[PDB]
Amino acid sequence: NAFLEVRAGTGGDEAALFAGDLFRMYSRYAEARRWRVEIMSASEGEHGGYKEIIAKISGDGVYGRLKFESGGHRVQRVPATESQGRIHTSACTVAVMPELPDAELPDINPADLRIDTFRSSGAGGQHVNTTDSAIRITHLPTGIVVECQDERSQHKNKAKALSVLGARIHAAEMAKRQQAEASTRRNLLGSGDRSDRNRTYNFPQGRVTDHRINLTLYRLDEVMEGKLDMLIEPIIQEHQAD
RNA sequence: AGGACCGAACCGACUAAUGUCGAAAAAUUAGCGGAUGACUUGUGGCUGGGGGUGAAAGGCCAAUCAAACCGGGAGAUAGCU
RNA sequence: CGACUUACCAACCCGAUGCAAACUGCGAAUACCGGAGAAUGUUAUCACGGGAGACACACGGCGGGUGCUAACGUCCGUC
RNA sequence: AGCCAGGAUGUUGGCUUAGAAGCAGCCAUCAUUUAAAGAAAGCGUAAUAGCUCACUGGUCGAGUCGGCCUGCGCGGAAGA
RNA sequence: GUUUAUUAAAAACACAGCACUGUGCAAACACGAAAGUGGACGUAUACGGUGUGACGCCUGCCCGGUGCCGGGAGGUUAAU
RNA sequence: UCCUCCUAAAGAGUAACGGAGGAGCACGAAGGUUGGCUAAUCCUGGUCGGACAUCAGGAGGUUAGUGCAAUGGCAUAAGCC
RNA sequence: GCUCAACGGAUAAAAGGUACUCCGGGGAUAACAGGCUGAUACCGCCCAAGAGUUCAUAUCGACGGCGGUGUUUGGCACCUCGAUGUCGGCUCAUCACAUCCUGGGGCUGAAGUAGGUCCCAAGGGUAUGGCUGUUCGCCAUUUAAAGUGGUACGCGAGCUG
RNA sequence: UGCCUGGCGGCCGUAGCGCGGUGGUCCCACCUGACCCCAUGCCGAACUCAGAAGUGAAACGCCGUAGCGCCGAUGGUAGUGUGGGGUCUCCCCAUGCGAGAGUAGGGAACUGCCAGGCAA
RNA sequence: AUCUAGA
RNA sequence: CCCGCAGAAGAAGCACCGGCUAACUCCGUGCCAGCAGCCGCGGUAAUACGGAGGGUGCAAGCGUUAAUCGGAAUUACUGGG
RNA sequence: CGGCCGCAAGGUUAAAACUCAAAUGAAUUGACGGGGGCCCGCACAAGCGGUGGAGCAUGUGGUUUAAUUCGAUGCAACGCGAAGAACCUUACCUGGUCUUGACAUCCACGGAAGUUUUCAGAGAUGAGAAUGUGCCUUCGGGAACCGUGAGACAGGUGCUGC
RNA sequence: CCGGCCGGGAACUCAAAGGAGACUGCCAGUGAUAAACUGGAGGAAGGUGGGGAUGACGUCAAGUCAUCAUGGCCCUUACGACCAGGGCUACACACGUGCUACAAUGGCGCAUACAAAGAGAAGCGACCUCGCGAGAGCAAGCGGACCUCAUAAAGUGCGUCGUAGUCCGGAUUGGAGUCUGCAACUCGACUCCAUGAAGUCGGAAUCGCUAGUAAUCGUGGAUCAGAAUGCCACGGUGAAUAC
RNA sequence: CGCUUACCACUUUGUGAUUCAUGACUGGGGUGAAGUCGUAACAAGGUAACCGUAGGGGAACCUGCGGUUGGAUCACCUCCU
RNA sequence: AGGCUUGUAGCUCAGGUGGUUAGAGCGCACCCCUGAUAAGGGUGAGGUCGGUGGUUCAAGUCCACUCAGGCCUACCA
Incomplete structure (x- = not known):
């Protein structure tokens, strides 16, 4: 399964209105192969479409079919918010992140x-001078100590020093996972600007060029309702080339 | 000139050691603060106990004070020892 | 809207087998109340009157609650 | 129970042709040679090989093996 | 500067300065059953109380609560 | 404070900051007496009507009801008219 | 005529502080220390799926089991309230061994050098500084090693505070 | 006194359910009609009256059959009073009492008082 | 009230 | 510094070509690759990018870069506001 | 920033790195003003009947599908191109088939064109069988048609109305 | 034989040709003694009589490369060509224009009146008969001022229904038809019989319209074998309003 | 010769002045063919703008007090000029 | 650790006491206004009331049981 997430780039109104029309394109593609698509979040634009739309697509090998769409997508057309009628060039950026399920965040192993x-x-x-009533617990494989010295009995210091210990193994792991979310998303989501990044969509000529495997499909109605079979398929061939 | 400075008398009491049945019911020895001031001091007054006086600590009021001392109610009361 | 099959859970009834302080179509020993009969017991029994103490118990046997079928623990009953 | 003994075969199995063959799964779990023995437990393999095993003969030659009811013992059992 | 004489000398107390408030003088307030004395032989640039504590830059919003103050209509209300 | 069960050891009684639940009312009739009656829950058939409204029959025999907590009871009925 | 409900009802009508405290008492009842116990703690052992390139058992070992010690926080309140000075440091130690080092062995997933782990063994040895009142701990740099504990978590009629 | 039937019982499942038949001269159950005594929270179904034509169907009774209930030994086991014992949160020994369950079996009742019909 | 970015 | 010898034989690159600035068209790419002293070219028909041809400048040199002055009467005394 | 000045707020004297090829002044022709004046229009006011509600007809978007051909999409697209989709049109899809071709000129040979008829197949088509062999003379040929051969090509309702 | 059907006649209606006609010509006022405006006469008509064609320089990088033509690019055993079936008519919905209605100034039944503009030969098609009706048989005429579509309808008279989701409304459906076309299943139109739904003037907003206009009523043409509620035209009746 | 004296070089301590690097964090500045909040300015820019200063405010800013024209409308009332 | 108090539409809250019926603002969907967006106007949907089990004729409410959030207390030694 995968997270398809289309952020709009340059041309903040028009490419919002176009990221609506990439989301409908893979939306039309996932319905073709019978995959579940679900809009988990959608920041709408000003005049239609979206500034970002992160939508989980589940199914049968979603990631290997759709991992090649990460990057920019430069859009040559006459806009909708264009009262002079000239061409404007924009970009949308897509990321595709895989499913990556969850395992138990603390191993609370007291050994x-x-x-x-x-x-x-x-x-x-005289109680402080004699009873111990203070506890450090040290998780050895992580090196996170926590000292709880709150109450008179050491048991209600120890259960607290196992609760906060468990929550710090949990949050110190979730910053590694969440650290590696934006660590990879920044590398895949491009700079946003129109320097060509992995496709074009040229509506006045009618042409589509994916920069790799310099394909020159002239379709653009056979792309804008799914049907990017001919788009993706030589890329997966020249990806199984290596 | 100065609630100025250093410093004896003088007033005090921050520090340590000794002393803790001591030389002394708070002292000594070596240091220490103020030293013309809101200083300190002699002698005589004045305020009296739910009262005094207090640059205020419940401090001081005759070695006694979150209510003096003495005599009385009194042989209080004591489910306590 | 005709209808569809199943690698699949499972009510009642049927048969077998267990558990219960707050379950009983069964049911002891003991204990308790009552009457009859000897024997033994310095009337041990009861009612009324004077004088008290004491009302902090402890352990051991048994039947238990509680506790961890812990405690020279704590609470009952009986000895 | 020992001991110079003997103790295979197609089944390099088809089977998931990535190897499995006795030795990661499927499994069936025939039957020959027969004085007798298996289409098989464990090591060594990449799997082979290689070392072994239940069984079968000679001689030696007499009891031998494993459970129940149990009596007493042993270990497990380390302090200021 | 003062401070718990006789375990505490301080960051505590006081201070100059600031503010609020009361007091028109037979002053408020205080000590006094009372006469009376202090306030002060002073009179609002004076005097008492409360907080804050030189100096510099400043001191925001809330009158619902509890006070204090002004009002006096209406209700309730004592002895009579 | 009071009621019911268990602890409570087959009479009664019996503790714990032991285990579980209720009461601080209701009713001029839900009291008396006479007369009459018998459930709960399923199945079959049936107008809308339905698993769950009313009907008829059958199974069942108190699993019902008892003004309200639990125990004890209760068909001669203490339940229903 | 009373949620006199604290229900055998002290009033017709009543909240708190005291580390400024005081008195009469109690170890009838708490904080320290000793005790009995061992939930907790630490240390062994049992079975064994797995982890270890195949291999349960060099090493770890889940789901579960059985015990030791009296160190930990606890349980009880048995001793002490007509007083049993309570943390850490200093000086001084002393025993146990469940050994940190040194000494002797077994196995190893032991080539060597170095290790891991287990058995025997208590004869001697077992840091110096920064931080914090600190025990503990973190850090720096050593060392053959920087052992775990009992001793009123030893020691104030020895010192400090 | 031999056999029916009705009432009142004693008794309380060896007695009650099943399954199979069996009776109508009387008695009983049905059944007919519903002026009127009387009733229906509608209805002569029930309750009440006046009857007998018919039926033994339904019920009621009787007889038979173990499919069920049900009763149930003997012996052992469990518990347990009293006295001692241990390898003590549970057992033992001596001794007295002795279950429940299950088994062999038992079993489709017995019995009075009166009244009517029969054979005597 | 606003109306991005290719004469 | 002079003759012989012999054979065209041993001897031409570098920058530029959109306006400033002398010198143009075709192909390749398609805001990419790239150029650039400024203005600005490349977004599918580019005299501005890369190559060809052609031309233009200079020449055993040519270009870039760096530095100075000039044009800059844009530090003005000549010669400004 | 540093000095001086000020009770402070601040003032006074006064840079630099860096960034852009502009910023500016006046004046002009426009366009615009929720600036002004003068006019105009079914623009408003004055009246009439409607749309939006219903049902259907039709066009469009959207969605669907194998295809739902393509185009128009404020005013100035949406009963528009279409003055008329069963087939045809038709450009779209599925399946079958053809390639100098359904369409024209050349070159070469052959074969009058034309009619009639049968078998297969959804049909295009193939496989045939009859039938006539006429209009001018180089008569190894002319002119109308027709089949084969390759090459010049034909074809495109493919793309850009930027 | 009351049929403009016959003799006939050239008045008139009409039919086209040529001409006259209206130009601020006339008058008064008013105005800079100027253009021009208000009123009045005449006049079928009054001041651009009512309508139409006629669209300046330019504006939209507006629309069309799919009417046609062309630059460029592209495919050229294909995106070119032929063929049969399907599709452009699909349907959770939204928007635009319309047609029919919600009724009693109306529906239905009968009798009856009054036009313009057009089209017609691999066409229009009488007459007569048959069929309930769409239509079917023979068929006269006419490339048409004569022949054909073609009964114009709203209108008027007389009944009738009495405010009902109805004798309103006509969707939707079932059955039988008829035409054209090789062919009516997707998907034609029209008739007959049964069917008889949503709908009781419509939210916020909103459009056209100043006179033979709006509104309403019918008719014709192109396209076309058939197939319009659209378009293009024609006449009937015929308003309120502008301060 | 030697010794001694004065001068003086290296050197050493003390505390400064300056410049150059460097510094967790922080104040404003510039640029960026896209973002969020508003619309302060240009027309009387929809409250005329702007200068000084003070106060407040998410921000452009707003308000006070004074000043300037580098501000538009003035046959709309009314009529005397 | 207890003790008291929240949980209702996508978000923020009433509705809960008082047992029989689910609302508000914003958001969202649809249609107008607009050159187009925002604003605005008209129309509309949207809940098993934190999950679990009792009482009752009936649970959102009433009693237990929890789960996630919040405040208070946790002292003398």
Whole structure:
């Protein structure tokens, strides 16, 4: 499965209105091969279409069919918000991120946990001077200690020092996963500007050129309702070339 | 000139050691702060106990103070020892 | 809207087998109330009157709650 | 129970032709030679090979193997 | 500068300065059953109280609550 | 404070900050008496009507009802008219 | 005529602080320390699917089981309230061994050098500084090694505070 | 006294359900009609009256059959009073009492008082 | 109130 | 510094070509690749990018870069506001 | 920033890196003003009947499909191109078939054109069988048609109305 | 034989040709004694009489390369050509223009009146008969001022229904038809019989219209074998309003 | 010769002045063929704009006080000029 | 750890006490205004009321049971 996510680039009104019409294109493509498409979030534009539309597509090998659409898509047409009638060039950017499911974020294995019970500091009287009532727990494979020294009994210090320990293994993992989301998305989502990045869509000539495998399909009605079979297929051939 | 500076008398009491049945019911020895001032001091007054006085700590009021001391109600009361 | 099949869960009834302090179509020993009969017991029994103490219990046997079928623990019953 | 003994075959199986053959799965789990033995447990393989095993003969030659009811023991069992 | 004499000398207290408020003098307020004395032989540039604490840049919004103040209509209301 | 069950050891009684639940009312009739009656839940057939309204029959025999918590009861009925 | 409901009802009518405190008492009842216990803690053992290039058992071992010690926070409140000075440091130690080093072995997924792990062994040895009152810990740099503990988490009629 | 039938019982499942037949001269159940006594939260279905033509169907009774209930030993086991014992949160021994379940089986009742019909 | 970016 | 010898024999690149600036068309790409002193070219028919042909400048040199002055009467005294 | 000045707010004196090939002044022709004046229009006001609600006809978008041909898409597209889609038209799809071709000129040979008829196939088509062999004379040929051969090509309702 | 059907006649209606006609010609006022405006006469008509064609320089990088033509590019055993079936008519919906209605100034039944403009030969098609009706048989005429479509309808008279989702409305459907065409299934039009739904003047907004206009009523043509509620034209009746 | 004295070079400590690097964070500036919030300015720019200064405000800004024309409309009332 | 109090449309809240019926603002969908967007105007849909089980004729409500969020308390030693 995959996350198809189309952010609009240059031409912030027009390419919003066009990112509507890439989302309808792969929308028309996923309905052809019978895949579930679902708009998880959609920031609408000003005059139609979207500034970003991240929509999970599930199905049967969605990622290998659609991993080649990440990058820019430069759009030559006369716009809708054009009262002088000249050509304007814009761009949309697409990313395709794979499914990547979840596993249990803490392994709460207390055989890894060095439980350090020591004497409390602060106030208490003769109780502080003698009872320990303070606990460091050290998750050894991660090196995250947390010291809970809150209450008089050490048990309600220890259960707290296992709750906050579990939440810090959980948040310190979720920053690795969430760190690697935008680490890869930035590399795939281009700079947004029209320097050609992985296709064109040239409506006055009627032509489509994917820069790699310099295809020169003149279709543009056989592309704008799915039917990009001839678009993708030589790319997967010259991707199984390596 | 100065609630100015350094410093004895003088007033005080930040620090350490000694002393803790001591030389002393708060001292000594070596240092220490103020030292013409809102200073300090002699002698005589004046305020009296739910009252005094307090640059205010519940501090001081005769070695006693979150209510003096003495005599009385009184042989209080004591489910406590 | 005719209808469709199933690698699939499963009510009642049927047969077999278990559990229950707050289940009983069964049901003890003991205990308790009552009457009859000896024997033994310095009337041990009861009612009324004077004087109290005491109302902090503890462990061990058994039947239990509770606790971890922990405690020289804690709470009951009986000895 | 020992011991110079013997202890295969097509089945390099077809089968998932990536190897599996006795030795990662499927599995069927025939039958020959027969004094007798299996279309098979474990190592070594990349799998082979290689070392072995239940069984069958000689001689030696007498009991031998494994359970139940049990009695007492042993280990598990380390402190200031 | 002052401070718990006899375990605390400080960041506490006080201070100059600022503000709010009360007081028209037989002053408020205080000590006094009371006469009376202080305030002050002073009179609002004076005096008492409360907070804040030189100096510099400043001191925002809330009158619902609890006070204080002004009002006096209507209701309730004492002795009579 | 009170009611019901269990603990509570087959009379009664019996503790715990033991386990579970209710009460601080209702009713001039839901009281009395006489007379009459018998459920719950399923199945079959049936107008809209339905798994669940009313009908008829059958199975079943108190799994119902009892003004309200639980125990004890209750067809001679204490339940219904 | 009373949610006199704290329901055998003290009033017709009543909230708090005291680390400024005081008195009468109690170890009838708490904080420290000892005790009995062992939930918790730490340390062993059992079975074994797996992890280890095949291989359960060099090494780890899930789901579950059985015990030891009296160190931890606890349970109980048995001793002490007509007083049993309570943390850390300093000086001084002393025992246990479940050994950190040194000494002897077994296995190894042991070529060597170096290791891992397990058994025996307590004779001696076992840091110096920064930070924090700190124990603990983090860090720097050593070392053959920087052991875990009992001793009122030893030691104030020895010191400090 | 031999056999029916009705009432009132005793008794309370060895007695009650099933399944199979069996009776109508009386008795009983049905059944006929519903002026009127009387009734219907509608309805002579039930309750009440006046009857007998018919039927033994339904019920009621009787007889038979184990398919079920049901009753149920003997012996053992469980518990357990009292006294001792242990390898103690549970067992044992001596001793007294002794279940429940299941088994062999038992079993489709017995019995009075009166009244009517029969054979005597 | 606003009307991006290719004479 | 002179003769012989012998054979056209041993001897031409570099920049530019849209306006400024002398010198043009075709093909290749299609805001890409790229150029550029400024103005600006390339968005499918490019005298501006790359190659060909042709031309233009200069020449054993040609171009870029760097530095100075000039044009800049854009530091003005000559010679400005 | 540094100095000086100020109680402060601040003032005064006064740069640099960097960025862009512009910024500016006046004046002109327009366009625009929720600036002015004068006019105009079914523009409003004055009246009449409607659309939007219903049902259908028709066009369009959207969606669907194998194809739902292509174009027009404020005013100035939407009963428009279309003054008329069963077939044809038809350009679209599915399936069958053809390639100098359904369409024209050349070159070469052959074969009058024309009629009639049968078999297969959805049909295009192939496979045939009859039938006539006439209009001018180089008469190895003319002129109307027709089949084969390759090449010059024909063809395109393919693309750009930027 | 009351039929402009016959003799006949050239008045008139009409038919086209040529001509006259209206030009601020006339008058008064008013105005810079100027253009011009208001009113009045005459006049069928009054001041561009009512209508139409006729579209300046330019504006939209407007529309069409699919009417045609052409630059460029492209395919040229294909995107070219032929053939049969399908499609351009699909249907969760939205928008535009229309047609029919919601009724009683109306529906239905009968009798009856009053036009213009057109089209017609591999056409229009009488007459007569048959069929309930679309239509079918023979068929006269006419390339037409004569013959044919072609009964004009709203109108008027007389009944009738009495405000009902109805004798309103006509969708939708079922059955039988008829025409044209080789062919009516997707997908034609029209008739007959049964069917009889949504609909009771329509939200916010919104359009056309100043006179024979709006509104309403019927008719004809092109396209065309058939197939319009569209387009193009024609006449009937015929308003309110502008301060 | 030696010794000594004064002068003085390297060198060493003290505290500064300056410039050059460097610095967690921070203030404004510039550019960017797209973003968010508004519309402050250009017409009387829809409240005339702008200068100084003060106060407030998400921001352009808004408001006060003074000033300038580098501001438009003036047969709309009314009529005397 | 207890004790008290939230959970209702896509978001923010009433509705809960008081047992029988689900609303508001914004958002969203559709149609007008507009050259076009915003604003605006007209029309509309949208909930098993945090999941679980009882009582009751009936659970959004009433009692347990939790789950996610919030505040308070957690002291003398």
